[model samples]
Target: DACVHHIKRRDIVLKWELGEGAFGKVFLAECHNLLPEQDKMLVAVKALKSESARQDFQREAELLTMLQHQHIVRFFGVCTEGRPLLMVFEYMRHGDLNRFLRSHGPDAGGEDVAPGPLGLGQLLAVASQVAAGMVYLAGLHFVHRDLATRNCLVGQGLVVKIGDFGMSRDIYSTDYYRVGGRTMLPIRWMPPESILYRKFTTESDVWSFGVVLWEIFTYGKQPWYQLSNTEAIDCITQGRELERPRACPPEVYAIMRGCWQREPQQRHSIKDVHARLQALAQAPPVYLDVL
Candidate 1:
């Protein structure tokens, strides 16, 4: 499989460590030594130490390689030769958009002329890219069961690419998983249909996208931060809704509200969201949160 992508063990030299999770660690790696023409390439290498974890990494590789979209993280390849099986991808310089939003949140300070984080125009730009990626994945019948600001990676400038996107039927656990016949759901981001009926589909993804927009507008604040999981569930099931982010333009907030409509049948399409955001992007840059 590694040969298919022309990536080899000898080609990879691990650099500094990035953040980590339960299964493994991520490292910033230099692979251009082998492919000299691409002095520009800096890839992130995700390693899984245990045997089962390694196998899962293979599954992730297969999924990533199958789907290549501009708004999706570009998969470099994989190396499963020995200990610490690895998967590689385009390195996101700013790391998670979630953190970026938090750092440049409403309380953040920066020169007025620069593009500030959580700025309305940048926020819509990121959302448009995310929706574009979503449109591609849904057309291929894959659902990004885990869609949030944390998984939306930030790169040079304000480019945001949706990461950790996968099909519910493909493999287990990037976010959602099956047990007891129901897909375990993320509390704040889940739609009523998914939370109540255990269903996950492209529509559910739209719901999560709305939540991610919440993160964008709120500058990475947790969805329903003040509410417990049960409280959130009750509110959604009982017809409650999220308030608009401070200074959010009414037109943009309208999209989020549409995505949060309780009935999946009542929700907007990926293209619908994309169209609105794209139109918003054409407007002059507006800094809403911290200018």
Candidate 2:
């Protein structure tokens, strides 16, 4: 059997509206009898709002059921028994990594950027875990077209899991740009090849991963925050890259530079990136609490 649990719509009750995207809405929900031994479970439920999103939602459900990894969000199942199709996933305590980082980062309090809850050590842990998750996705030949901190979930102890592929579009609309006057593209996180050629590969995802790392170290500062979309595009096309975040180590910034190479083949493989991050996570002064 495919292990895709078909959740009864009636068995799930909305607890709170978590967030919304252009084509869907997510809810913090209570799922009854999710496990025979456990009576109630807290889950994030995604409900579709459009037919196109429905198709992608269906595809995502099938794909997610086969994905089993510690750093990936757990997919409980789907509900097609009612109008708005539903997909249930494990709830993340800290919510999206972007928001988590911003609220707990060094710059949390004011323009002076005072120290906050998350230290550099914890940030390294976040980067490494995300790299670990991407390494798994790369092995599966899965191309996460949308790879950003906004799409990653954070749990207790700084645990992070890749989730909501392209699902948080509306919530972080500033992260994306409406291209061709229609489709919204995360131009900031995208590489030149992807931005110009519509190319999406694990390599492209690696590029986005670099941007995610920048987001991490900058405490969720938007990539190319100062530039307009067209200007950012020109800069990327011209081979310019994001400057190092004040708190980002030189070595870490080097890793980010590697991922932004113009040629996809020239970029570091996900495995290589993971190894680099893993090493840094274990290295001096950056002690990881738990991996």
Candidate 3:
């Protein structure tokens, strides 16, 4: 009877806490008889409280349920009652990228030294994985409004999976265009257009991806926390660009700059990003020999 009454039909047995988000608590669970033999063993159960807003929960479930890609987190299904709701997803053993990066830092008691600049080879590998996920998402015409290092989950073999589709929206809809005003995004990661006009487009996600690249290069430092959010916005609007990470190579820096371009239409497409990373991957070690 571990399953809530509303979800009893699914035979989901919640075992322990997985994580918590704005919506509700997530638990590791087993979905008996629901998945194939290989997939039946483990899953994540997100239980939304009775008081939670149904629109937000339903939106996340609806969006994730439609996506299917190796680099994108998989949504299994959902169970809903009058108020309480539950969503199931594939379990990721390695947790989120933020936690992974923290684990590697000095506080984790492993290494006092910063992991040196990730070489071009390693950068390309991670970038390719992220681009593959972005390409798949764009193909569905889904815009992941928040594309940051914190949402990228690192699974076994350091495989990257994009998670947290709560802010995602379908780009084909006119509703997105009608929404106005400058809503505050993560200031350090936002593109110029989104920062200036408070409007987001598929191209805005590309701008955030460039910030992700900077995070990866700097071992996960926020771009402009050195200043207040308003200050960061002012600086960005006045033609200030983030300084390249000390460890980032020139080519990688150039690509990151391309992503943060002031003009949304001039930003690199996900396909172009994938091609650039793949080419970097196949290039000689000299380009990535940062050791």
Candidate 4:
């Protein structure tokens, strides 16, 4: 309980609206004296919208507070004492990984200001870090329930962190499938069991991680981008899998394929995936040129 703090509303100065999330609006803000000896720091503030959203916000704050890892985004605190409750998190300079990849290079109509912006080894490093984060969550018996490139945050130095609170679906609505026009789910990232039965476990997360890996290699391309939600479901149920991401090493694709196994028990464990990714990160440099 002491791990999470109660921050005052006045201490935060909202700069601008970062984006929309499931809870409410996310703002880029500065926090004054959050710590006794610390200086003012930039933070991302998530404001709750309604009474129902507040309940979910409480649950998310608790979850965020308990997660502590290098690849897990740090939770600063919360401002529940005031109206329009706010949840403060450390500011990720590079923003979400999805947009970062999509915004890189001439192909996206953006120039790469830096040389060798996204090489294969660098992309592998990103995936490995995410796997490490998932390993931490799995060890704690925590299920992410939702895992995708959009849910991952990137900071300077290409550091990636698992940092979504079910709020990402609102930002990337197309990434989620509307069930009968009511319930929404990250259908592409989900495995057959999770998509059909609504069952989630560490193995389910592994399945999603595979999609995230695909996203990284594809430079944030939507999984099965050519297929509709229903078509994708049918494809997965029919034992079809995501094709290899262009320029992705065979070894990397093998790891992803292992995670996409139809049977949860047959899928690679998070630990297994982490080890594979780490091994690739250490191997000889293989430059994948994607613009």
- Which candidate leads in TM-score? 4
lDDT of 3 by residue, 4-33 (tens): 122343578789987665446788998876
lDDT, each prediction: 0.75, 0.84, 0.70, 0.83
Q: Which ten residues in a row have the lowest lDDT in candidate 2?
A: 106-115
Task: List pairs with backbone clashes in candidate 4.
Answer: none
Give the true-structure RMSD of model 3. 6.7
* Candidate with more favorable, higher lDDT: 1 or 4: 4
Deviating ranges (above 4 Å) for candidate 2? 1-3, 50-56, 107-117, 165-167, 284-291
- Which of candidates 2 and 4 is the stronger one according to TM-score? 4
Candidate 2 lDDT over residue span 123-175, tens digit each: 88899999999999889888888889988998765689998554567777777
Which candidate wins on lDDT? 2
Once fitted onto the true fold, the runs of candidate 4 whose alpha carbons sit more than 4 angstroms away are 1-3, 35-38, 105-113, 284-291
| TM-scores, all models, native as reference | 0.86, 0.89, 0.80, 0.90
Per the 3 Å backbone cut-off, how many clashing residue pairs does candidate 4 have? 0
Candidate 1 lDDT by residue in tens digits, 1-291 = 533253677788898888666556788998865456886468888877565766566676777888888888888787766666778888888777777777777554433214455556767777888889898898899987678777778787667787873222232243333456654566678888877897988899888988888778888787788887778889877878788988467777899988887888789998889898888876654433332
Candidate 3 has which clashing residue pairs, if any? none
